[PDB]
Scaffold this active site. Sequence first.
Site, PDB file in Angstrom:
ATOM      1  N   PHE B 142       0.885  -1.242  -0.062  1.00 13.49           N
ATOM      2  CA  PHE B 142       0.074   0.124  -0.209  1.00 13.49           C
ATOM      3  C   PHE B 142       0.965   1.274  -0.337  1.00 13.49           C
ATOM      4  O   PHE B 142       0.735   1.914   1.036  1.00 13.49           O
ATOM      5  CB  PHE B 142      -1.017   0.013   1.363  1.00 13.49           C
ATOM      6  CG  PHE B 142      -2.208  -0.972   0.901  1.00 13.49           C
ATOM      7  CD1 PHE B 142      -2.127  -2.409   0.898  1.00 13.49           C
ATOM      8  CD2 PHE B 142      -3.433  -0.277   0.775  1.00 13.49           C
ATOM      9  CE1 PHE B 142      -3.103  -3.057   0.941  1.00 13.49           C
ATOM     10  CE2 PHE B 142      -4.640  -1.145   0.684  1.00 13.49           C
ATOM     11  CZ  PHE B 142      -4.140  -2.481   0.430  1.00 13.49           C
ATOM     12  N   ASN B 200      -4.704   6.199   9.422  1.00 16.95           N
ATOM     13  CA  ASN B 200      -4.305   6.325  10.538  1.00 16.95           C
ATOM     14  C   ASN B 200      -4.726   7.742  11.210  1.00 16.95           C
ATOM     15  O   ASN B 200      -4.657   8.470  10.555  1.00 16.95           O
ATOM     16  CB  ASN B 200      -2.963   5.624  10.894  1.00 16.95           C
ATOM     17  CG  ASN B 200      -2.739   4.728  12.240  1.00 16.95           C
ATOM     18  OD1 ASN B 200      -3.601   4.781  12.833  1.00 16.95           O
ATOM     19  ND2 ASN B 200      -1.637   4.039  12.060  1.00 16.95           N
ATOM     20  N   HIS B 203       1.429   9.023  13.815  1.00 15.31           N
ATOM     21  CA  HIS B 203       2.806   8.181  13.588  1.00 15.31           C
ATOM     22  C   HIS B 203       3.904   8.814  14.083  1.00 15.31           C
ATOM     23  O   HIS B 203       4.070   9.931  14.037  1.00 15.31           O
ATOM     24  CB  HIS B 203       2.843   7.764  11.917  1.00 15.31           C
ATOM     25  CG  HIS B 203       4.205   7.081  11.800  1.00 15.31           C
ATOM     26  ND1 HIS B 203       4.392   5.638  12.064  1.00 15.31           N
ATOM     27  CD2 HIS B 203       5.244   7.573  11.301  1.00 15.31           C
ATOM     28  CE1 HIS B 203       5.409   5.111  11.614  1.00 15.31           C
ATOM     29  NE2 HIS B 203       6.065   6.443  11.205  1.00 15.31           N
TER      30      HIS B 203
END
Lengths: 436, 372, 48, 426, 425, 106, 42
Positions: B142, B200, B203
């Site tokens: 991805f 998300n 990070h």
Amino acid sequence: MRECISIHVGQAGVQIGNACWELYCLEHGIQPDGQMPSDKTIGGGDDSFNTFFSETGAGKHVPRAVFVDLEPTVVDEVRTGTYRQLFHPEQLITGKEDAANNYARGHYTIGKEIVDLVLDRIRKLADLCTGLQGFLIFHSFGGGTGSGFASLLMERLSVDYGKKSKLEFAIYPAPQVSTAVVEPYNSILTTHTTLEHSDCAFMVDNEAIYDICRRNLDIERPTYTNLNRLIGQIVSSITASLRFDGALNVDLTEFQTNLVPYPRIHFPLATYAPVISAEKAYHEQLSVAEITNACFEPANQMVKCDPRHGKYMACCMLYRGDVVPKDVNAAIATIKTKRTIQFVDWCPTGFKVGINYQPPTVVPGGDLAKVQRAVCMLSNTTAIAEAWARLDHKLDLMYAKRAFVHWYVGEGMEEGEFSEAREDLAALEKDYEEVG
Amino acid sequence: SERFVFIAEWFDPNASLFRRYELLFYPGDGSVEMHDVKNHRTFLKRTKYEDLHLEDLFIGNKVNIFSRQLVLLDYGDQYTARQLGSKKEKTLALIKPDAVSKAGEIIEIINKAGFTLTKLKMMTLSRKEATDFHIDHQSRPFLNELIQFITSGPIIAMEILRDDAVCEWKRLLGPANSGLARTDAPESIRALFGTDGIKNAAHGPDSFACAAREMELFFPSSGVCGPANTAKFTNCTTCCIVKPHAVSEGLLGKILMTIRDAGFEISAMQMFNMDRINVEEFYEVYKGVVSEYNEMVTEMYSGPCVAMEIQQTNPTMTFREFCGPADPEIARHLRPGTLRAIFGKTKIQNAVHCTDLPEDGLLEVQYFFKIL
Amino acid sequence: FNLYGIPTPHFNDGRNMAKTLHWLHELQMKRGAKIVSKRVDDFKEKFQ
Amino acid sequence: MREIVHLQAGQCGNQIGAKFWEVISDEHGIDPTGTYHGDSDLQLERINVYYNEATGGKYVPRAVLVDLEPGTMDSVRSGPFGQIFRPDNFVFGQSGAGNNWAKGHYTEGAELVDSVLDVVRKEAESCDCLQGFQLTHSLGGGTGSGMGTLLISKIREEYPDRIMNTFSVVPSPKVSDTVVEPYNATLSVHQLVENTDETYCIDNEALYDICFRTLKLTTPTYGDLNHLVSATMSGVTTCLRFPGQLNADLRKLAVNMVPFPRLHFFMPGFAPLTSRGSQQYRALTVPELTQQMFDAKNMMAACDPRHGRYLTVAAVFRGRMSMKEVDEQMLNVQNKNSSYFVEWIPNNVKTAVCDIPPRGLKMSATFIGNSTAIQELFKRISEQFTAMFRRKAFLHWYTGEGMDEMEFTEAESNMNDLVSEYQQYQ
Amino acid sequence: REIVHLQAGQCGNQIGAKFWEVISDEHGIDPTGTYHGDSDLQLERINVYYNEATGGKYVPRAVLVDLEPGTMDSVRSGPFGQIFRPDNFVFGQSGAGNNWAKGHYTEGAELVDSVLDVVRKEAESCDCLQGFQLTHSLGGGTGSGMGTLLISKIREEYPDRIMNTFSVVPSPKVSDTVVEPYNATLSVHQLVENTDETYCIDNEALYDICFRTLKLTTPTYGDLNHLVSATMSGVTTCLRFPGQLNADLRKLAVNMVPFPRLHFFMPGFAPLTSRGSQQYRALTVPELTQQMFDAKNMMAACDPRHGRYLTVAAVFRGRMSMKEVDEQMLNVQNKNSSYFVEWIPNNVKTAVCDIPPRGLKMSATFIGNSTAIQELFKRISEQFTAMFRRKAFLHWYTGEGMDEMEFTEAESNMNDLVSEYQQYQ
Amino acid sequence: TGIKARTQQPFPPTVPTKPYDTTVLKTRGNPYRYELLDFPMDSKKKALVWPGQRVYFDLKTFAPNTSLNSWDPITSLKEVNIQRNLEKSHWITSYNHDFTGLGPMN
Amino acid sequence: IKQTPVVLAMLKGPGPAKYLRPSCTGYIDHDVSMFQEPAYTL
Ligand SMILES: Nc1nc2c(ncn2[C@@H]2O[C@H](COP(=O)(O)OP(=O)(O)OP(=O)(O)O)[C@@H](O)[C@H]2O)c(=O)[nH]1
Ligand SMILES: Nc1nc2c(ncn2[C@@H]2O[C@H](COP(=O)(O)OP(=O)(O)O)[C@@H](O)[C@H]2O)c(=O)[nH]1
Ligand SMILES: Nc1nc2c(ncn2[C@@H]2O[C@H](COP(=O)(O)OP(=O)(O)O)[C@@H](O)[C@H]2O)c(=O)[nH]1
Ligand SMILES: [Mg+2]
């Protein structure tokens, strides 16, 4: 600047220097090998060790003191114990033989062939630092080297320097309790030749501090190690103002101008008030208003001469730690307002105040406790006139039948030296009672 | 004792040279003393100083010791390096394009867990900047989705000061898949504000070398700035600066929350630690119109300030009425729902400084986002 | 190894003197605006 | 314009000067770096009174610091405000004075007087028009009492028309700080009269009475006392550097104070002095500062005015006030208690009103007063002197430095005339 | 027209602390010093009792003086005790010990010089002084010793003003002190000569009026202090509020004192109902004026039945008409003609204010100069002569600068004053 | 000046204010009665809670009001206005009752 | 005695120079509060 040179003569002076210099290495961060710790320091900037330590290229802090003892046997241990890398090897001067309780042996025969070496080392110490304030010589009276060789050095230091300060501590014989038989001879002969060569002599005895180590420190059967640490505590509290900031700084040339009215009256006794154990301090609050009062107690005082009968002439309070000037002045007014402290009529001022901003340090192993307030009153009083009277009464008893004299006149000493020494000690006794 | 030694550097404006120093902090007996490296001597004695705190002492921090903007460069010793390097660790705290709107909670959880913000700015990443980012993710499944996700909207990157900072922020993040965070380890920010495994919330790095490389990508050392600033110099543009007083006790996240709740949206944000000569080049329009000005000007260079751009999209209430009166007591008497009524106090360290003149909204935003 | 003795807190630079000569009535106009009643205002405009 | 040259002799003078240059730098908004950071535009337009500057707009104080020891110079230089002072304004010697009027005045200070005269006269010439000289020093010490006494001796030798201002830190009545303080007090006061125009005496136990009874502090340190002394002492030269309605420099004060040149011993005060918990219930009006300034618990010499009538009074005022109320208050306090004022002067009070109050206050004042009751202090010093000197007790500390024995008799007899010729003119 | 307030002793301090309660909630003064009232009338004459400082905080003209340091704590930590000026709190270290000697002669000579300074500071900053107020207990060692010392030292300084003393007279039922008669007869000797008006309070009469009139269950000292404060605030009400008739603090002196040493009064407060039976009383002027002259509505133990009134005051508060007031005064004179002296035709003095007390509708305040007060002084004389005859507790006085002849002179003036009160009946 | 006015921190100017927060060192053993009196920073005052007895701690009545904020009946707001106006009607004075306006007052 | 008037505040009383205790050094006049230590004869 603000430097001082300490002279340590005799067994008493060289064993005081093994405990006062422990305190000196503990106020600053000086390890017993004369260095700062692993880092635990700055890359330069601190200069509070300038009074007692000299800064070299590698960072070693070499003390500016001289250890002298005609006996080799005592300096052998400061050079082999846990402080053998701190002292400069030529600052520890020893000879062949001891003086053996003889003024003559330490003053005339064995004194001379070591004086030149000691003076050479004092010269080498003096040009190492620019602004020198005075000398702090510690010795004894009842011995042979601390009584003879030190008194020989007073004559050699008053001609080469002149107006430098000469402060004495000079372990003094106790009234009821003694160690050597012939010590009145040495005590009188070392007070005869050290009158006009000194200006401050801080008399202490080994009996009152024994009783103090039974007062406050909760120890039984003490020894000299419990003595020299207290002595060095008051030594460092006397000269605490040179290296630490405070409100009223007091230099080394201050005690003479206050505590010495007349050139023959220069014997102020010391007193450390907050002597206490850690257990005994747990139930008492350490305030200014009781450490001021503890200095005037006959219990906490030095030489047991009963100062109720004496007359105070000049005091010098040197405060230390968490102190504000308000309660100091209130306590001074309180102790002034009380009648039972007799003050002589010609001293309406009577007090000298020096306030520092540094709490005292404690040693690992000493029974003294961590506190916040400390004073050292160097009090000049007439109550030591009885001390001289009972000191030279023993000479009057011993000289009445010429006992022990043949060890003196048989070695570099004249019979007429004894009579004039007792005569001028009688003059010193006569002028003390006309100042009351 | 137990002093803490630092190497300092103060720039004399009178003589064009840098003067190195050595400051010693004493915890408990809170006090400083100063020493000089070149021309070995002392500078400032043991004086009890009240504005210096242990949380404000780290590498790269500007501190005020008696009206001097001295910088910290290194620890003096290996004792202080041992007793502070285990508690001063830097790691990157990134925020993905989602939860840029939900950013106040991220700052709130960061401030609640014992973290200290030193640097912060809001950017968008270009194609090459988002391709060097995700370099370990090259030729993995991805890649295009993450690349086009990063390049979608604004990106908020901020710094982190805590003992064991990398592992603690990875613990606060939780597992990368938001389903696992929702099921296995909940109350994490990936459970709260993450939707997919690509989508998300935030990070961060796992080690020190990856954190250093990420830091050099996002924040170059000095001078050149890598990414843009996303400043929207539009007609309805105004400014508000968060005083270091508010950022010290973690009011930044609640400020962001209550600004997003009122409908005002934020187009740019940046963390600044301005020098004295720049704030006294910004605030001297308040010379003589305010009652107290010297402590007002030294308050906001006493630490790091958050300068942000805010646009008026809430109808019938401009932002100058949303912040409220300058005096917080007039705010609390008159308009209890405003920003100064519930956040700031004492009229000097109030919450924020909104622009007073509606003509002057582009000038100060312009200043903060191009001049500095 | 414990500090024993009554601690008297004191400030040596002189900040207590700086604080005590600041006259705490306009120290608080620096950190706000004083809020007195309104009837006393209309009295003080009229008989003061 | 009207520059003032500051002198700081001795360790007490150095501490007071350090606190003074801390506190007056806040009136003019001077940071410890040296630049200017203020709120108003009025605090820079009279910077010439106390400050000289250099290339860069940084202002240095016009003060010359002297101590025989270099010890307190490190305390001054390493304080919060230790960088504004000029590095070569610190003159110092190799040794200490030891609280002797001989060592700091005849032998060691005789080398340092020329060193401080090197800098003092240059700092005098560079001003376009001087106002006078200002000295902070101690009396019971040796460096302030020996160095600065020869300084005020050989400043009037070459500046005979300038105003000499000294801040005589006089010893306390009950508690003493030095054993030989009557010598250093008498021998400095004897040279004070012939070489000073304005002398204000500040005690230490009076400051203590202030800080415990009218300010209600529990732990008064010397920083608090120095700040109080500097706050009183920054109040005399207010009109020299701030505009007002009735301005007054130092010369106008000295004209209104002394009627005779042997009578210039004053006694200060400071009006807004109340406990910090007691500021709520006290208003700030002229008829309360007037009440506080004439109270016995607001005067630093600690002499009861019931034992002597005032000669002349000055009251420098600060703040936007009404002159009418000040004239009312002064007339009323002169008329109510007529037994404590002389009769041969019609108006005993000089009023000067500045317009700028000190920062952190809205109304303040400074009270400088010539009083006959200052003779009580000289009587105490004379009693101590005749108790100690009466058979040459401490002669040997004052013979080895070249001081003659008859100098004590002159220093007593020419100071005892400050009592015999002080009650006739009363 | 301003009043400087004084209070000495524990009882006087508590009475003053409850009096300032009534004053400060009358004028709408907050317990911290701010203003929270509604009417503009409260701020008109606020300078009578209060001082204005910056911040708009209002502080009383009260000087706090005693001997015992623990009664600071009963004042500063009180309900309205934070408004007092801390610099007016002066007292010494050691206690009084319930001695007149310790409070008047030896220990008290070093406190009077410090309390007169605060009195001068508070009184000389006024625009026009009117008089002084003192609350003290005649049976203690502080209020009876230092009270008369302060009255003596104040009368010489300000001779042309008036004096108010609110003295708690000893009671035989409430015997809380062994040396009660000695402190009783050593106090009023110096209270007759200089003080021009004196309101005498008896504790047993206060207990009787809390038992029979208010029908209270458990009356503590707070209720009695509230009643004596209600009397206290009703005699100066014309100074603070407008009305249809005037009576300042000197018109009471001129109307009520016909001869110089007959100035002892019997204070009272009329509108006192039962505890729950307020629904059954008509709040009219005839009902209150019938209750006002009733014997058991007094605050002194002496019965007005046994003597005759010389003068009578009545200070009304409320918007009542003057016809029923003066008609009812005419009635109470006409039907009690044996109880008023024949050589004075009109024996009542009336005054009407316009502000009633907080929590009422209309109120009055009875002050009475009567010859029935001789019995109280008579029983004090019996209690004195019982103790003093055998020289009972004399060694705590004669050991601190006393003679025997001082006590006999005090007793001589006691029976002399009783003779002057009796001779005019 | 009622119960609902006794709750808001900027209370309306008719409710009395609490005496300020003090720590206490009673004399009774100490040389000085020290009191650290906190002065609340203007807007954070407090409505006054205990005018019944000593503010110290305590030592049989109501020091505060009885209408606790837990339970309901504080209603009938027309009912409580009447006594507020009636106490105000007792403070009107005679001259303002008669010689005010063009005659007496209805 | 007791009939002499004095202010009770001016009764601080004797201070730190009225009493001495007996010595621990020596059997002659040993204070009765500590270990005496033996005093062996011939
Ligand atoms: N307080 C104290 N006194 C000591 C110490 N060491 C020795 N003395 C005293 O000194 C006496 C011993 O003789 P010293 O004078 O020290 O011997 P010396 O100085 O080496 O002289 P000579 O023995 O002749 O070589 C004893 O009576 C002790 O009173 C010590 O460490 N502390
Ligand atoms: N007010 C005040 N007085 C001081 C200060 N320092 C010293 N003194 C006074 O100075 C007197 C002694 O001066 P001294 O220390 O001998 O000055 P020196 O001659 O330079 O050594 C003492 O009586 C102190 O009261 C200070 O910081 N403030
Ligand atoms: N009315 C009233 N009387 C009191 C109060 N407290 C004490 N007393 C009376 O005052 C008398 C005690 O006098 P006190 O003040 O203690 O003596 P002093 O301190 O020397 O003045 C007792 O007989 C009590 O009956 C009070 O709160 N109210
Ligand atoms: Mg030896």
